[PDB]
Structures are given as structure tokens and as C-alpha cells.
Structure 1
Amino acid sequence: HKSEVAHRFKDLGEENFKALVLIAFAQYLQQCPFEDHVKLVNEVTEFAKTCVADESAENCDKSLHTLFGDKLCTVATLRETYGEMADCCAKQEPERNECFLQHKDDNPNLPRLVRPEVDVMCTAFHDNEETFLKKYLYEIARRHPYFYAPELLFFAKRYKAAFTECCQAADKAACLLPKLDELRDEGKASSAKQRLKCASLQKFGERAFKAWAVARLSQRFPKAEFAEVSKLVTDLTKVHTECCHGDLLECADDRADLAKYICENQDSISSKLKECCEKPLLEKSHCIAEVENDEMPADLPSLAADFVESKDVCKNYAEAKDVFLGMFLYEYARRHPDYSVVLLLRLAKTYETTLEKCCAAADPHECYAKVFDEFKPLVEEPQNLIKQNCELFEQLGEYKFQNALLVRYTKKVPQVSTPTLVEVSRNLGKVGSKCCKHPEAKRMPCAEDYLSVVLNQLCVLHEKTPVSDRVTKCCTESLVNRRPCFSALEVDETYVPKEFNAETFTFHADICTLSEKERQIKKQTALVELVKHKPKATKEQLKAVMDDFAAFVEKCCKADDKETCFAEEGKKLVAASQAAL
């Protein structure tokens, strides 16, 4: 263990080191040009090979934290470009690394990355493959300076995979665009989850996080003993607190540790793990954390012995409340992978709340014998909406369904921005497609999964530009109560309808040109605007107007002189709708 650079270069491989060095630098120095970092990276790599050859050589003894610092502080235009940051360089180390972390900018002012024409990509990718990929790695890096670097590195390679396949396929855009849309979407998702998880830790504190993890880890490793789960939860909770804080190496090394541990103690934890524990350093902890729920033990009791019918319960509770409730959750979670992490927390919070009454009451055993009764309705609420709504998505496909929701929520929260209403109805809709194709024993996690990100995205927009007290309530409640609070929203019976607008219901023959996506967005803005103009309108009345609009369109887009039909027939539609409503 002579040299941390040498170890990390041996550990990683040149090609990975190089990628990670690049992502590291790109995250701290977001206003420098790609070609500058190639210079850095290669300067570091060239250096890193010295030490691999002879860990005694100049500076090899130095700390990665110290060599990264020294590198940063030899950028000349550093005060010019960044200003405050430069002042960090005047600190001797331990603080200096902190000072660079402090003065990172999350969310700079940078132009949106344009996706080129398919053919430009494939061509460039052929012409010069590495410079193509790293360039774009450099661009996502600077735009997400707090994203775990090897996770990012993992996407680059799924990216490389998608070029390698489709730029040798006759119909390039037919292949590539969905693959890339998948990845766009799967990275915004990921890059939100991290922001949520960290924000959850600061606001709600370390306790609740452990609660969450226990439920989770127990769902995943049901054969493990509660102490093992506790060992895991604990270290895992360290890991999130350190990775949030933004130190790459602390986050990395901590994670590495945990992967060693899990694979060394493999038999104690999960059968479904051999696979992952084969994969090399970088992929290990990624893989572990993605992995399937292990199959549950056949020989499995009711909980009721240890948590209802035993005496010694109030003693066992009071002896250590958080550990006893831990045990409750461990036992309840591993019996139910088909529950949402959050569902299981509603059980524990409800349980908790009874013992607070019943251990302090005259007859404890009798104050609480009817408590798993209290769970019955808590488990059915999420189960029912799933059945109800996945039934409804079965009737009307993804699209007709999106419009069902678009009506639903526009009624509930009419004050929302119309685009905002369209995007979430659209996004929700998609969840329906994804999660409803699973069986019932597998739906409720999937949906928690998705809803949680949508529901957050929702609440960030709202944080920035507030529009509704009732929304604010949900976004400023526990991540446990979040989804129900939304489900609890009712039709806004206060709402004053919006002044009719001629232009809003005028359409032109340009929509017949537009892609089915493009069209649908046009149609769907209308439907909202319609809902916001005549909210007191019935589904029947609405399916009426919607069907007319639909015929109208397909009349003027199967007609000579399209433009003048849209002005004339549209004149009718509006008057005849204005009427019916």
C-alpha cells in the first residue's frame, strides 16, 4: 500500500482511471473546455504510470485528495474564471478539499445539450469514437457535479453499446432513438433519486433513513438474521451520509468496503448474489445494489407470537424501542416484497403509535390485541388504486388513459401551469405502461419507484414557482405520507373558470404534418385548457366534444384545401361545443 494513485490505477485499469479522472475534473471545473481536461487527465495518467512502475518516485506518496488539489491549483485562468475557488488554494490540505466541495456549483447556467441528427452522431462516432464519447461524458459531468462518478461512467458504456449496435443497422434512427430516450429518462431518474435520498436525510434525520433501509434490506435479504440487517443498515447509512457530502473517494472507498463485506459474508445474506460478487471492482456495488429480492424461507410464522400474544412485549419495547420496532419491520418486510417500502412504514408508524398508548394503559394486552386489524385498510388503499387504475389503463391504451388523468388532475388542481399538467399526466401514464405489465405480487414497488420521482419533480417545480397550498402540504410532509396526500386531493370546487380564448381553440393544418408525439402534445394542451375553461363539465359531455374534435381533425386532414377547412369546420366545433357546455 505504497501509493494511492498506483493502487487506484492498478485497481481500475488505465481506460477506467482515465474516464474517472475526466469526470472528477469536469465536476470541479465546469467552465473549462473539454480539451483542457484531456490535458489534465493525460498529465495525471502519465504521472500515475510513474508510480505504478516505482511507488517510491516523486510525489507518489502524496494523497489523491492532495494531488487533485494541486492539479486544480495549477490552472492559471483559475482566479479569472472562478474567483472565490482560487482562494481555496491558499489552504493546506484537509480544509482545502472541503473548500473545493463547498464551492462546487450544482445547476450552473449552461446551454441545454442539443441532440444532433442521428446521422451526425453515427458518423462522428465512426470517425473518431473516443473523442466522441468522452466529449459528451465531459458535458454530462459538468451539468451534474454531485452525481456519483462511476454511475455516470456506467451510462457512457450503455451509450457506447447503443452506438455500436445501431450505427451498423440499416434503419439507424429506428434503432437508436428509443435506446437514447430510455437512457435520457433513466439518468434524469437516477440523478433525481440521489437528490431525494440526501434531502431526505437532512430534513427527516438519520433515524427514518434507517427505518427505510431496514424495510428495504429485509425485502432484499430475507434469509439474513436481524443483526446482519442491522450491520448492513448501519454501514449503508454511513455510506449515504458520506456520499451525499460529496467526497468522491470517501464515497467510493466506503462503498467498496460494503461490497467486500457482502461478498465475503455471502451465505449469511442472499443466495441471489454469486453473479454480482464475481463482477470487478467498479461493477460490484452497482450490481449488488440493483439485485433481485432473494426467495423467502418456507418455514415462516405469523408475527403474532412475538408482537401480539407474547407478554414481555412492553418490556422488550421499552428495553430498546427503535430496535424492537426495527424487529417488527424486519419480520414484516421480508414476508412482503410485494409491499412498498413506504407501505411497510405506515404499519410501523401505526404500530409504534399504539404501544405509545397501550403500554401506558391499564390492560396493555387487551388495549392492543386488535392491532393487525388496523393494518387491513392501510394495505388495501394502495392495492386498490393499482387494481382500479391498471384496469383503466387496460381499457384505454397509454394515450386515452393519459387524457383520463389529464382531466382528473386538472380538475383537482386547476391552478397548475398547463404544460406542467400535461408532462405529469403524460409521465404518470407511462408508469401505467411500465408497472401494469407486472403481476400483483410485483406492482406496488415498481409504482412507489416511479411515483416517488415524478412526485418529487412535481414538488421542485412547485418549490420554485408555488401555485397551490394543498400541493405545498404534500411536498412538505413525510415521504411516507407524500403519495396519500396527493391521492387525497379533491376536485377544486372553488375554481373560477378561465376567460374563453379564441386562439386557444383555433387549429391549423400544421398538426397533420407533426409526429404522433407532437400532435398528442397539441391535443392534450387543448384538453386541459378546455377543462380549465369549463370544469363543471361531465365525462359524457367531454367524450362528446373530444369525439367531435377527433372527427373534425380527420376530416380536414383527408381534404383538398386543408387550411380553409380548419378555419371553417373549426368555426363550427367551437360554437357547437361552446353550446353543449
Structure 2
Amino acid sequence: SEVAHRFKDLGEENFKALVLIAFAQYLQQCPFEDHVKLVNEVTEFAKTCVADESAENCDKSLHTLFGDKLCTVAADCCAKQEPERNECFLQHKDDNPNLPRLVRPEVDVMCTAFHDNEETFLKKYLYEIARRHPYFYAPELLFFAKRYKAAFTECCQAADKAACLLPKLDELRDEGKASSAKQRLKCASLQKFGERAFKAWAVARLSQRFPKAEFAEVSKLVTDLTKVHTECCHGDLLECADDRADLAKYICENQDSISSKLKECCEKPLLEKSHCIAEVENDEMPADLPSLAADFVESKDVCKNYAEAKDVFLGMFLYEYARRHPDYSVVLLLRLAKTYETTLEKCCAAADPHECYAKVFDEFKPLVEEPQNLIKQNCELFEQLGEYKFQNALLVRYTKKVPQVSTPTLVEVSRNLGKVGSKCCKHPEAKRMPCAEDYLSVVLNQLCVLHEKTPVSDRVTKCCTESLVNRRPCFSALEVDETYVPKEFNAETFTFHADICTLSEKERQIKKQTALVELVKHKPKATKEQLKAVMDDFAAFVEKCCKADDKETCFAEEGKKLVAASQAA
């Protein structure tokens, strides 16, 4: 029995949690009650299997059971069987589910709901997150859950809860979105580029983090970590959680051989231990390390070793270059590794290989300076405009690049892209690139998966599928879509009402930003000069109309003077 197996390993509390997340991630539209019911029904059945490991259908695989339980409340997917049936659901997960924005009642109500029924109050949190983020890294979601419980348990019994809770919840909201983003990239890689791509990223990233570890050790870690994520992303949540625990034990047992910063981590609860390890800082770089050129460019055995085991050889190249360059982004290292390989492929077919591949590091110089200059420039620009204006500059740039993309998606993506300025520019040159470019990777991955749902821009498709590691330079190289046909104005699109006034300070900018997007789609060729000059106007429309007697019509009157002056510029 597979169900009994995992039940013992995870226990009842986690098992029930993981199954709920799984159901919430497959059927995101179904209500909380229905999942709660199915979970229990499933959970009890599991209990009968622990005892009689051959009772009803305890022999069946997880998918079969999970599939049959969901198929009692859904249709074509359920018509299929075992493999095809499961893949069916996986292809139907919605990255942008049409769910009602989530608003949180007053502090008083929450605490009451939490104190009254604790188990319910948390199952709903899980439920509401899992259905909105169908790819959220399950094991890590149980971590946020406990952290969420700790929030209420502490803040509901204080002087001013509003002051104690609201903040901690905001910190959880953001970090949860960050987490969801990083994981979405990991699944995309596995699913759209194959495990080989994922492994390389893991080699380089892990080699940067565990510099003292041996290639064979990293290789072992990478292999396991790969299976973990391969399972989570494919919906095998139980086994993913299982395998992720094992990996944590292993890393802790073998600390000394891996890293010296894993101490603090291994001295705490499971969920905290896993989370800790996955975010540990890079270990100090080993003192006396030979020069790379030695075994990789000067040696005369290059081509031969390359021939014998291309995979291990290139893997070793990556590990060696990555370990001594924590100042490089994972994508740069991988670009370097691709340059190296391409060079051996052509050079090892020449008369005198050595001569041909003797100056490979001169090919590296350009690749290393591009990111640096890009980052140096844009942070200077950021330092000058602030986050709001920078986001605007980004909205103008990205809409001109890929005008077909939906306004909701461009707004979302550009705002996030702007946050990279705030998150990374503060760091010194040394840690700027990892920060900047790996973050850009995450954010452009969102653009790519949202877009894939309804493709409308071949330029996006090409930049998203051509190469995982070159996505950023691909997009950065785009200027303005010269074949794009300007849109024709729509009264409704530029009609600002008083309902703006009730909206938060942010929900406003978001409105003004959405208008800037629409404007640029109408006037691609427009200039950053005119754009500004028009934005400030909109600012005026808001302050007036919003504070001028009983006027829900000023929105039509003040808005008329708006579009009028708008159609002029």
C-alpha cells in the first residue's frame, strides 16, 4: 500500500495538509467544503490501510485514488485513465485563476475565527493559497502555515493586535509571492526545458553555495534535489515532502563535507531546518585554488576528456568556475559553460585543437561585462527616479517592446521588474549581479507563463522558448515592435470616475500606470517627453474630481477635459 506508506512517514497532520493542497491545486474553482470532505474521506480510508494493508484498494497508486476522489465532484479529464487522466489535470492548472481578490476582515474577526476553530482557520489559509498558486512548493507551504499560526497565536493576545498582526501578515504575503515565483521558475525549467537544464542550474547554484564540497558530493545533492522538485512540480506532493525531508537529514549528517554555515540550520525543527538549508548563504571560498586555464585550456587532454564523458567534463567545468565566482549570476555561469562547450565542439574537430581553443577566456570577457554595464547603468537610473518613476520608465519600455501583451500582465510584470531596483541596487558591486539577474529570471518567467496561456506576441514566445538562460538578454535586446499597428481610443478605457478615490494610494498609481500602458499602445512612437507631460495631468484629474462637492459626474466632466487635452498631445 502506497497510501499507508506515506501516511506513517508524514503522520496524520501533514498528510491531511498535503492532500488538501493537492486537491486545492488540481481543482482551484471548487469550494472549501468539498475539498475538506474529500480529504477526510481519503484520510479515513488511509487509516484502514495502515491496519489491513490489503483492504479495499490499498494496493492502488496515489494518482488513481486521488483521481477517483476528485472525479466525484467535477469532465473530459475524468473520462481518461491512469496516466492520461493525471496529465490532464496538470495541464489544466491555472496560473492566473479568475478568483475574487482576497480581502481580510478586521483584526477582531480573525482572532475570533482563529480562537474558536484553529484547525479550520488554518486549512482555509492553505486552501486559499494553494488554489491561487497551483505550483507553490508544497513542503514550504506547510512552513508558511506554521509561521502564520505563530502570528495569530501571538498577536491576538496583545495590547494592539492590529499593530502586531497586520505587519507580520504583510511580510508573509510578500515572501509568499516571492517563494511562489522562484518555484514557478523551477517547474518551468523542468517542464519546458528538461531535467538536464534544471541540473545545470543546480550544479552552478549549489557549487556557488557549497565551494568546499566535492564535485561528486554536489552531483549527489543535485540528483536528489532534482527528484524532489520533479515530484512536487508533477503533483506527487506526498513523496516530494518525504524526499525533501530525507535530503535535509542527509545534508545535516554530512555537514562537514558540504558547508560550515549549516550549523544553525540543523539545530531546529524539520520544517525550519529544510527552509533554513535552502536559503543558507554561500560558504567561504577555499584558499589555494589552482587556475582554471590549467585543466581546461592549457592541458592537451581537453578534447580527449571531453570526448570520454562530455557530461561529467562540462559539469566539472561549471562546478569549478561557479565555486570561485559567487560574484557571478547563475545565468552568466551557464552562459559561460555554453560558450566553452560550443568551443570544444568546433575546436576538437580541428587539426590542432589546442591552438583553436587556446583563447576561450577572451570570449568570456564580453559576456561578463554586458551584465555589469547593464546593472551599473540601471541602478544609477533607479537611484535617480525612485521606484515609482522607474516602474513607469519600465512600463513605457516594455510596452514598446511587446505591445500585444495584455495590459494587466504588462502592469504586473513591470511593477515587479521595478522592485528589482529596490531589492538589488542597494548592494555593493560584488553581490549585485546574482541579485539582479537571477531576480529578472524569476520575473520574466512570470511574463512567459502568463503569456503562454494566450499567446499574442511571437516576440515573447521566441524570447521565452529559445533559451532559458538568455531570456533576459533576449528581452533587453528588443527595442520597439516596428510592425505593431497602433490601437484606436476607447472612451471607457480612459474614463476616470470617483471610485478611484476610495482605492488605496497604491491602487491609484496602478490605475495611472494602467492608463500609461494604454496610452503607449495608442502612441508607440510617442516620446518620454510627451508621456510625462500627460501623466502629471492625470494626477490633477484625481485630486480635483475626488475632492469637489457631490460629483460622481466630475468624472465625466473633468474626464472630458482630460481626454480632450489627451487627444491633443
- After TM superposition, the score normalised by the length of structure 2 is 0.83
Give CA deviations for 1:505-532 in whole Å, capped at 9, x if unaligned. Answer: 4444554443211221221122222223
Q: CA deviation at 1:90?
A: 14
| Most deviating of 212-221 and 184-193 | 184-193
C-alpha distance in 2 between matches for 1:96 and 1:556? 55
Q: CA deviation at 1:350?
A: 0.6
Tell me the C-alpha RMSD between the 2 structures.
Answer: 4.5
Residue 534 to residue 287, structure 1, CA distance change in 2 (3 Å): same
Q: CA deviation at 1:476?
A: 1.7
Q: Is there any run of 5+ residues in structure 2 with no aligned partner, and where?
A: none
| Most deviating of 23-32 and 127-136 | 23-32
Q: CA deviation at 1:105?
A: 9.9
C-alpha distance in 2 between matches for 1:482 and 1:207? 17
Q: CA deviation at 1:208?
A: 2.6
SS of residue paired to 1:560: coil
Give CA deviations for 1:208-245 in whole Å, capped at 9, x if unaligned. Answer: 32222111110110011212122222333333334444
Q: CA deviation at 1:579?
A: 4.2
Aligned residue for 2:235?
Answer: 246
Within 5 A, what are the aligned runs for 1:376-391? Answer: 376-391=365-380
Residue 515 to residue 234, structure 1, CA distance change in 2 (3 Å): closer
Q: CA deviation at 1:332?
A: 0.8
C-alpha distance in 2 between matches for 1:337 and 1:572? 55
Residue 544 to residue 71, structure 1, CA distance change in 2 (3 Å): closer
Q: Is there any run of 5+ residues in structure 1 with no aligned partner, and where?
A: 77-85
C-alpha distance in 2 between matches for 1:558 and 1:61? 69
SS of residue paired to 1:190: helix
C-alpha distance in 1 between matches for 2:540 and 2:76? 67
Give CA deviations for 1:300-336 in whole Å, capped at 9, x if unaligned. Answer: 3331222122222222222222211111111110111
Q: CA deviation at 1:178?
A: 5.2
The 8 Å contact of residues 16 and 39 in structure 2, kept in 1 or not, is answered as yes
Residue 300 to residue 59, structure 1, CA distance change in 2 (3 Å): same
| Most deviating of 8-17 and 324-333 | 8-17
The 8 Å contact of residues 343 and 379 in structure 1, kept in 2 or not, is answered as yes
Q: CA deviation at 1:381?
A: 1.7
Q: CA deviation at 1:23?
A: 4.5
Q: CA deviation at 1:399?
A: 0.9
Aligned residue for 1:162?
Answer: 151
Aligned residue for 2:205?
Answer: 216
C-alpha distance in 2 between matches for 1:556 and 1:95? 57
C-alpha distance in 2 between matches for 1:564 and 1:351? 65
SS of residue paired to 1:262: helix
| Most deviating of 210-219 and 282-291 | 282-291
Report which of the two structures shows the higher radius of gyration computed on alpha carbons.
Answer: 1
Q: CA deviation at 1:128?
A: 2.9
Q: CA deviation at 1:113?
A: 5.5
| Most deviating of 493-502 and 550-559 | 550-559
Residue 416 to residue 393, structure 1, CA distance change in 2 (3 Å): same
C-alpha distance in 1 between matches for 2:378 and 2:244? 39
C-alpha distance in 2 between matches for 1:138 and 1:156? 11
Query: Which of 532, 547, 550 is the equivalent residue of 1:561?
Result: 550
C-alpha distance in 2 between matches for 1:516 and 1:106? 27
* Higher RCO (CA < 8 A, seq sep 6+): 2
Residue 168 to residue 488, structure 1, CA distance change in 2 (3 Å): farther
The 8 Å contact of residues 19 and 153 in structure 1, kept in 2 or not, is answered as yes
Q: CA deviation at 1:248?
A: 3.3
Within 5 A, what are the aligned runs for 1:404-483? Answer: 404-483=393-472
| Most deviating of 147-156 and 6-15 | 6-15
Residues matched between the structures, number:
569
The 8 Å contact of residues 303 and 331 in structure 1, kept in 2 or not, is answered as yes
| Most deviating of 480-489 and 315-324 | 315-324
Q: CA deviation at 1:130?
A: 2.8
Query: Which of 524, 530, 539 is the equivalent residue of 1:541?
Result: 530
The 8 Å contact of residues 11 and 281 in structure 1, kept in 2 or not, is answered as no
The 8 Å contact of residues 243 and 251 in structure 1, kept in 2 or not, is answered as yes
Give CA deviations for 1:359-410 in whole Å, capped at 9, x if unaligned. Answer: 2223322222222111111112222222222222211121111111111122
- After TM superposition, the score normalised by the length of structure 1 is 0.81
SS of residue paired to 1:198: helix
Residue 407 to residue 35, structure 1, CA distance change in 2 (3 Å): closer
| Most deviating of 366-375 and 21-30 | 21-30
Q: CA deviation at 1:466?
A: 2.2
